[PDB]
């Protein structure tokens, strides 16, 4: 047993490792989206850079779980990072719809971990999730939902001019 | 009778309280518009912020009537602030049309108060309305009429791309 | 159902709308206090400005609930904003006593919402209340209790010189 | 007839000369108050300086009527400036009560001149009064009423400590 370990349940330790893996998985999916939108036959570079930044964010969130695990005296255990579900992402609407689902999946895992931390009476883990994850998750989901509404408004998937304009005006110029 | 009161008719005092209530009512309607355009299924954030700023303006104009009332030795009497007529506002065109009607209503109440102040030979109240309200009212009505013309030009309500572009180009970026 | 909605109970959504209304109600009561202390026959302008600032704070806290509601995919539903319980507020002691009761009422509604969020296993709503409301509420209650103790010390309600001095020294010069 | 004169009734010209005299009269009364509060056996120097500043303000307002008269092609006609009604002013309360009455008298003369300008269809004279006089008059009356309320609160005329404190805290330090 680690000399620092206190009030840290084995189940929470294991769930933190799973959460670490899921954040790496999410980062990898966003990287795939980046590379798709960077293609010469897709060529929406502001959308591409949005996904690249989100890939970096998810990787940072993985690293935070690693640091957390060690702070509590748990032990980081890594597994394979599964490739993304798709090799190509259709268009900006399809990608953002997939991003929404991914954020919802990550959010459910965070909420499930909070339930487990609550069940095991671990307020430090509860605080960690609430302070570092749950609100930024809600913000990201809201942003992507807002995007989807605008892409539909712009006539995606059929309206290429709409898709062009989204890339110029809804995501930051890169 | 207040020690400061001079040339201030009871009818004007009461009409100032009604005007205070109407400005609060107007502020509340603009707040509702703000919240509508902030929805994830509406998501026109520059339009939303336009209405939020107008809500704050109308609240400031209410406060100015309160300060006025006391300066003249009248007594502020508050009533309920009625909820807005609608819970949802359709789209940017419908909202701006409602905003135009609201500004016209507020303008008519201001013009009616000026008539009353004139009838009661109250030049200080006349000056107040002319200097602090009537011209800014005309400017706001003109701005919103200009907006409506452009929203029609852009093909509202059917043309979502038009609605998107209005939000990017006609209202200030927030 | 909103595309962003996750782990958000209908009961919580409705309680958030009620909380929004209560903050608007509170703002309106403080506005009334402002106008009372601004009267020529009351004329305690630092006290007046204290209440004006608190009215603006409560309105900002209402706006935060609106933004919250939309972030979670709930729907803002507005009701009338009831006028304050009194048209005149006696003196600084009576007003501060009413302010204390109002803050206690708002605090109880916040604590009740936290209980509901807890019952519905909504940690994001719990965090929101804890991070944005509950501590600032405790601070405001403490400040007003401290004020009441000093107003009693100063001999309110009978001691006008005491009331004058409170306005010069206990609330910020405006 | 002056080469510049247009739409300027003889009655208005004469009333402007009377108004000029009244402003000089008012200035002189405030000067008397200044000298009273400067006495070694009165010695309220912030109150004294308040009245001195008001004497200078009223003299500037006289000068503005002179300039007005010439701008319209009327002719400045001066009369004696009557000494103030009192040689000594009692205490701060009595003085402020007299100041209130004086401001009310000046305000009534301004309102009477506005009525005359209205009757003679002189919008330039109306504008002049509204823009340069009527609102600053209302502000001064409000300020002095507020002062009187506070002097009563402080226990004037009997409470010397109250009178001392007013001089330190309600009027600007000179
Ligand atoms: Cl342990
Ligand atoms: Cl423990
Ligand atoms: Cl364990
Ligand atoms: Cl895993
Ligand atoms: Cl596998
Ligand atoms: Cl694929
Ligand atoms: Cl495409
Ligand atoms: Cl967070
Ligand atoms: Cl958006
Ligand atoms: Cl289309
Ligand atoms: Cl957008
Ligand atoms: Cl009157
Ligand atoms: Cl009159
Ligand atoms: Cl009347
Ligand atoms: Cl009303
Ligand atoms: Cl009703
Ligand atoms: Cl509706
Ligand atoms: Cl729309
Ligand atoms: Cl104006
Ligand atoms: Cl325009
Ligand atoms: Cl069209
Ligand atoms: Cl435009
Ligand atoms: Cl839900
Ligand atoms: Cl859940
Ligand atoms: Cl539900
Ligand atoms: Cl309600
Ligand atoms: Cl009711
Ligand atoms: Cl009452
Ligand atoms: Cl009082
Ligand atoms: Cl807080
Ligand atoms: Cl204190
Ligand atoms: Cl006492
Ligand atoms: Cl204090
Ligand atoms: Cl003429
Ligand atoms: Cl003419
Ligand atoms: Cl003539
Ligand atoms: Cl004369
Ligand atoms: Cl004589
Ligand atoms: Cl005398
Ligand atoms: Cl004295
Ligand atoms: Cl003025
Ligand atoms: Cl004062
Ligand atoms: Cl006393
Ligand atoms: Cl004062
Ligand atoms: Mg060891
Ligand atoms: Mg284990
Ligand atoms: Mg595989
Ligand atoms: Mg618990
Ligand atoms: Mg936080
Ligand atoms: Mg984020
Ligand atoms: Mg996120
Ligand atoms: Mg996240
Ligand atoms: Mg463009
Ligand atoms: Mg552009
Ligand atoms: Mg009285
Ligand atoms: Mg009345
Ligand atoms: Mg109703
Ligand atoms: Mg007229
Ligand atoms: Mg103007
Ligand atoms: Mg305006
Ligand atoms: Mg307006
Ligand atoms: Mg207006
Ligand atoms: Mg939907
Ligand atoms: Mg419901
Ligand atoms: Mg009622
Ligand atoms: Mg917390
Ligand atoms: Mg905190
Ligand atoms: Mg606070
Ligand atoms: Mg509070
Ligand atoms: Mg609070
Ligand atoms: Mg002191
Ligand atoms: Mg001091
Ligand atoms: Mg000549
Ligand atoms: Mg003549
Ligand atoms: Mg004589
Ligand atoms: Mg006029
Ligand atoms: Mg003016
Ligand atoms: Mg003045
Ligand atoms: Mg004046
Ligand atoms: Mg004046």
């Amino acid at each position: 047993v680690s000399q620092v370990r206190q009030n840290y349940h084995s189940d929470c330790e294991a769930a933190v490792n799973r959460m670490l893996n899921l954040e790496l998985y999410a980062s990898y999916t966003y990287s795939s989206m980046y590379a798709f939108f960077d293609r010469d036959d897709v060529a929406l570079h502001n959308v591409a850079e949005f996904f690249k930044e989100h890939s970096h964010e998810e990787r940072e969130h993985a690293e935070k779980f690693m640091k957390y695990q060690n702070k509590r005296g748990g032990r980081v255990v890594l597994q394979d990072i599964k490739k993304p579900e798709r090799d190509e992402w259709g268009n900006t609407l399809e990608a953002m719809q997939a991003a929404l689902q991914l954020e919802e999946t990550v959010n459910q895992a965070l909420l499930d971990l909070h339930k487990l931390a609550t069940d095991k009476v671990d307020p430090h883990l509860c605080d960690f999730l609430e302070s570092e994850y749950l609100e930024e998750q809600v913000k990201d989901i809201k942003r992507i939902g807002d995007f989807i509404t605008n892409l539909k408004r712009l006539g995606l998937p059929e309206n290429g001019m709409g898709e062009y304009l989204f890339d110029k005006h809804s995501v930051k110029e890169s």
Side-chain angles (χ1 to χ4, degrees), chain A residues 147-160:
Chain A
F147 284 169
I148 292 162
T149 298
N150 279 285
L151 289 156
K152 287 181 182 186
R153 167 180 287 124
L154 282 164
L156 276 282
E158 297 93 345
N159 195 322

Side-chain angles (χ1 to χ4, degrees), chain A residues 37-114 116-164:
Chain A
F37 286 98
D38 183 72
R39 289 166 55 163
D40 77 272
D41 58 4
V42 181
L44 296 160
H45 285 293
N46 296 331
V47 174
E49 290 299 320
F50 172 89
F51 288 127
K52 191 184 181 169
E53 207 62 50
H54 275 80
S55 175
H56 294 182
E57 174 176 347
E58 297 315 286
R59 233 275 168 190
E60 290 177 320
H61 287 183
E63 290 166 21
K64 288 174 81 162
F65 279 117
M66 292 189 270
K67 187 85 171 163
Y68 188 85
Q69 184 77 283
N70 281 338
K71 276 165 75 171
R72 292 297 304 274
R75 293 291 166 255
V76 172
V77 177
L78 302 175
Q79 303 296 345
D80 295 348
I81 304 162
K82 293 295 194 175
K83 69 187 179 91
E85 198 70 14
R86 290 174 66 174
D87 292 323
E88 70 81 40
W89 296 98
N91 59 58
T92 306
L93 177 56
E94 288 191 31
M96 290 293 178
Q97 285 167 154
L100 181 61
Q101 182 168 300
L102 175 66
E103 296 289 326
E104 173 191 33
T105 294
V106 170
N107 197 32
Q108 194 61 60
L110 292 164
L111 290 168
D112 292 348
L113 183 48
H114 195 285
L116 175 62
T118 296
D119 290 343
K120 302 304 194 182
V121 198
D122 189 335
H124 185 272
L125 179 52
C126 287
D127 167 71
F128 178 61
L129 298 168
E130 289 166 57
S131 298
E132 300 298 322
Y133 292 88
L134 296 185
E135 157 65 7
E136 74 80 32
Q137 201 68 5
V138 159
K139 289 193 251 253
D140 286 319
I141 288 167
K142 177 63 162 68
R143 179 80 76 197
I144 295 160
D146 290 355
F147 284 169
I148 292 162
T149 298
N150 279 285
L151 289 156
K152 287 181 182 186
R153 167 180 287 124
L154 282 164
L156 276 282
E158 297 93 345
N159 195 322
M161 174 181 299
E163 195 171 3
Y164 179 92

